[model samples]
Structure formats: structure tokens, C-alpha cells
Target: GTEIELESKNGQREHYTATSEDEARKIIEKAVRRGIKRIELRGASEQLIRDMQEIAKQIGLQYRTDGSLEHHHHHH
Candidate 1:
């Protein structure tokens, strides 16, 4: 499973779960239309990560993988 989260300039966020690269692409496209400025990807395949990096570069959007940060508190 892969999880993608989009954050807007105002700090608002939307999350989407995708099992396929195509689905992830669509989800990202939708977020762009809704003013997303950054994206965080988790449990993503390297292939998908590569594609997203390119997309982010071309769109001027921030991109990060879970490996980039390590302080997650999910005890709630």
C-alpha cells in the first residue's frame, strides 16, 4: 500500500491511499487542481517515487518520502 498526502499553502492537508501508480498520479493531479503545494509519500515503490519526483520538479511542488523524516507519533 502507498499513502500520499498533499498540503496546501494554507497548511490544509488531504490524504489519499493508492495501490497503483496510475491511481497515485490521478490523486496528485487532483490535488494540484485544488492548490496543493507539497506532497509526502509513504510506502511507495521506487518506480512511483521516480515518477513523482519528475512530476514535482516540473510542477514546482515540494516532494518528500518517509525516509526524509523520522519522527512519527501514531500512538493515538
Candidate 2:
């Protein structure tokens, strides 16, 4: 199972999960009790592939990215 958390610019945290309905319910229960907003995703020496990020863009996530690339050198 994986979890996602958001950090406010002021440094407060909110947590969320879409891992499973049962697990997500637990995260939601606590968040409702405490009051916060959160998200869903993965872990480890984390990296997002170009295809993966492109897919996210297609899905409307915008640049909610811990991901990128620019192996380019164009000059004229």
C-alpha cells in the first residue's frame, strides 16, 4: 500500500490514500477528525519516467511532479 501527503506553504501537513477502500477509509476517518486534504501515489529513491509524467499531464494532474527531464541542447 502507498500513501500521499501534502504540505502547506506554511509547513502544515495533510495526508491521503487511494490505496484501497478499506485503507483509504482509515486515512479519511482520521483526516476528517483532524481536518485536512490529501492525495494518492508511491515511494523509494523515487523517480517518475517521462511516459509516466506525460500520462499524468494527459490525466490533468498538471505538474504535480517530483519528475522531469531535459536532455536537450538546441542552439542556432
Candidate 3:
């Protein structure tokens, strides 16, 4: 489980939950089209955070997470 926060260029923001990296990417792209260049995540599994970070990098978006990955609850 993960909570994603996406901010559009115009300053609007929204929260979302994702089940997979692919699913997260799709929404992240959708956000980018709406001028969303900043993204923050929370409550993601350790493995998902890593995957999401890579996806954000590939998409050229700024990424951050509110939680740490040190808890060891890894999920793909």
C-alpha cells in the first residue's frame, strides 16, 4: 500500500494510492501531462519505494517519500 501526492504546475494537488510500479507510472504520467512535476509518496512498501523512485527518475520528475524504507516491509 502506498499514498502518492502529486502536485500540478498550477499548484493544484491530489492524493492517490497505487498497487504496482506500472500503475503508479501510468498515473504519474497522467499527472505530468497536467503539469505535475513534483511527487511525494507515503506508506509505500520498501521495495515499492525503490521501484517508484526509479520510475520517477525515468519520467524526469522530482520525487520524494514521507516515510523511510528501513522498516523492511518490502513489497513489489
Candidate 4:
């Protein structure tokens, strides 16, 4: 029977191993903290869509909004 072992982020699974459930929790917490800065939300909204394009000129965040009249029809 082969004992399957998972590799850690450092790529060494020798002496460095998760001691308890709290160790794994700490690893997840660190990863979440590091990832929070790069996260973003993307969607289509009439107000948000307009703001994105206008704000891009003032700020550095570039965005584009598109709409199609063929498939999208409203009674308003």
C-alpha cells in the first residue's frame, strides 16, 4: 500500500507538516488575507456601467460596459 502524502506550499513535505487542525486553519487564514487585495466584482448595471467608464478617466481602473437591443427588450 502506498502512503499518499500532500505537498505543502513550500513544496517540502518532510519535517514541515500541519501539527493540528488549527495549523490548517492558520494556513487558510493567511492565504485569504493575501488574496483579499486582488479580488474584484464584475457585473452589468446601468448606473455602475456608466460610472465605470466615467471614473476610468479620473482613475486608472479601465472598464467597459456593453448592451444589446436585440435580445434585450423592455416595456418601459
Highest TM-score, which number? 1
* Reference-based TM-score, model 4: 0.27
> Which ranking of candidates, highest TM-score first?
1, 3, 2, 4
Give me the displacement of residue 8 in model 1, in angstroms. 0.6
Between prediction 2 and prediction 4, the one with superior lDDT is 2
Best by lDDT: 1
Which 10-residue span in candidate 2 carries the lowest summed lDDT?
39-48
Q: Over the stretch 1-76, how does candidate 2's per-residue lDDT look in tens digits?
A: 4455544334587655455435544553444344333323343113333433444445443224332335454687
- Candidate 4 regions exceeding 4 Å error are 1-41, 64-73
Instruction: Give stretches of model 3 more than 4 Å off.
Output: 18-29, 32-35, 69-76
Which prediction has more favorable TM-score, 1 or 3?
Answer: 1
Cα lDDT computed for each candidate against the true fold: 0.80, 0.41, 0.74, 0.32
Pairs of colliding residues, candidate 3: none
Question: Candidates' TM-scores?
Answer: 0.75, 0.31, 0.62, 0.27
Model 3 is weakest, by summed lDDT over 10 consecutive residues, at 65-74
lDDT of 1 by residue, 1-76 (tens): 7899899999888888998778887887788777689998887766778788888888889888872323553587
lDDT value, candidate 3, whole model = 0.74
Off by over 4 Å in 2: 6-10, 14-19, 37-76
Q: Please report, as a residue range, the 10-residue window in candidate 1 with the lowest summed lDDT.
A: 67-76
- Shift in Å, residue 49, candidate 2: 25
